[PDB]
Amino acid sequence: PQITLWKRPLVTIKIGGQLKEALLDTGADDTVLEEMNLPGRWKPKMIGGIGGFIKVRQYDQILIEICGHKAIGTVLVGPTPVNIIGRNLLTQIGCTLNF
Amino acid sequence: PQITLWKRPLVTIKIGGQLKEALLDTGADDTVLEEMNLPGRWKPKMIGGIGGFIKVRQYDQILIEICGHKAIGTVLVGPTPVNIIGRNLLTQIGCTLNF
Ligand SMILES: CCOP(=O)(COc1ccc(C[C@H](NC(=O)O[C@H]2CO[C@H]3OCC[C@H]32)[C@H](O)CN(C[C@@H](C)CC)S(=O)(=O)c2ccc(N)cc2)cc1)OCC
């Protein structure tokens, strides 16, 4: 599909058997999701943006379905105000910017 | 052009007669540029990111050329880690997400 940017590019995703709304964010290097109890190992990480940094938990090789397109890679989890799909997974679903 | 996301979608912009590098950021509602001098009046505002809120200077109806495409809109200036082009201008250059 094609998504215009009049509104926030929010889509439905499926992770860990749960459905959620997430922002397709070309400005986010990596995917960061709202707090969730994922199983498996993880590593502490800090990511920065406007306002400073937040501490997150980095889970590796996590499968997420974005609009029926499957994608597997790093997923960060922490106190983010929004579910954010970053470039690490946007590339796997063939998402481009066009103008 | 069509822009892949294997690297950061950075482009050259021209604002106030000066060239800069800026990130096409579909997750940003507004355009936020690093500290710089711009002519005209401005109002102090605040924007929130992943790490909290920052203080910015809001410049309205600012001419800004993004990768050869002209836009005239709101430009925030403040301590952002990176020049980001938000949806308020991405819409003006006809930018869409496609997968
Ligand atoms: C909503 C209630 O909370 P809130 O309003 C903020 O909500 C938010 C917070 C963040 C976003 C996404 C970010 N957008 C953003 O900064 O946009 C600003 C300016 O325009 C406004 O549009 C909405 C926010 C304002 C951006 O796309 C991505 N970022 C990196 C960029 C900055 C490159 C350095 S990253 O997130 O830091 C990030 C960094 C590394 C990794 N691996 C993953 C993510 C969208 C909405 O404030 C109180 C918390």
The verdict on B25 touching A (C-beta cutoff 8 Å) is yes
Residue of A nearest to B67 (CA): A99
| Method by which this entry was solved | X-ray
Using the Cβ of A96 and the Cβ atoms of chain B, whether some distance falls under 8 Å is answered with yes
Distance A50 CA to ligand 1 centre (A): 6
Q: How far apart are the first and last CA of chain A?
A: 15
Side chain identity at residue B17, one-letter code: G
Could you say which DSSP state residue B34 is in? -
| Coil, helix or strand at residue A80 | coil
Helices (H), B43-94: 87-90
User: Which residue shows structure tokens 């505002």?
Assistant: B45
Distance linking the first and last C-alpha atoms of chain B: 15
Strands B10-15 and B18-24: antiparallel
Q: How many domains does chain A have?
A: 1
Rounded-to-integer distance, Cα B63 and Cα B82, Å: 19
Residue with tokens 């021209």: B14
Chain A positions in Cβ-Cβ contact with residue B81 (cut-off 8 Å)? 48-50
Resolution (A): 2.0
Task: Give the structural domain span for B98.
Answer: 1-99
**Which B positions 54-83 lie with beta carbon below 8 A of chain A?**
54, 67, 69, 80-81
CA atoms A17, A20, A23, A27: torsion sign: negative
